[PDB]
Design a protein around this ligand. Structure first.
Ligand SMILES: [Ca+2]
Ligand SMILES: [Ca+2]
Lengths: 121, 121
């Protein structure tokens, strides 16, 4: 487990700023609600496993031992989303947004719409 | 010989979209350079024969009369890649990509990297 600080997340996610119209504060809020800022977070379900800060699944986005038959859209091994370098996690998160949108993370709940200045550092 | 149209190929290959990070236009471009869209294309070498749209060889991927000792990774008879139903060809192409990558088809040449919108239908 390696839980980052809100300010650290804000800094590291600088590259996602306004990507797809999503402001930095919104990306920090999404991260807080997805993994609590833990870059090594791993959550398992009956049929899948989600990895890292962005909880990217091994069913469609990355490939791991549990499911070598994953669509592997991000063309990468899921364990790469468990380290300190968020560079590749960001490259993949951009694809998820582009393809499925912010609901991949927010699930139709408006959790990152009001008082967005609270997520600023 | 049954040469498809670019638009037909685009439609039939819908299932490969973003598989392994390969966009649909890239898959259409690969097909054009591999077989000219001919689903019955057969190309022979001194030691092997390649079949169909994806020119799958009977040395490692499928099994035919010429080489019953093929690794048969796709566990199928090569003639199955000579008909109209690209369903099984796609299942096998996914394996080739997963195992060897796009160079199985492109051979280290960047033929499907620029102006990819030209392959759209
Ligand atoms: Ca990483
Ligand atoms: Ca077939």
């Amino acid at each position: 487990m390696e839980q980052l600080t809100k300010c650290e997340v804000f800094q590291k996610l600088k590259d996602l700023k306004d990507y797809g119209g999503v402001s930095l504060p919104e990306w920090v809020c999404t991260a807080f609600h997805t993994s609590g800022y833990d870059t090594q977070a791993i959550v398992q379900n009956n049929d899948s496993t989600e990895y890292g800060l962005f909880q990217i699944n091994n069913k469609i986005w990355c490939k791991d031992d549990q499911n070598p038959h994953s669509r592997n859209i991000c063309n990468i091994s899921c364990d790469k989303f468990l380290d300190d370098d968020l560079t590749d996690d960001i490259v993949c998160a951009k694809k998820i947004l582009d393809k499925v949108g912010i609901n991949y993370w927010l699930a139709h709940k408006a959790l990152c719409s009001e008082k967005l200045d609270q997520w600023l550092c």
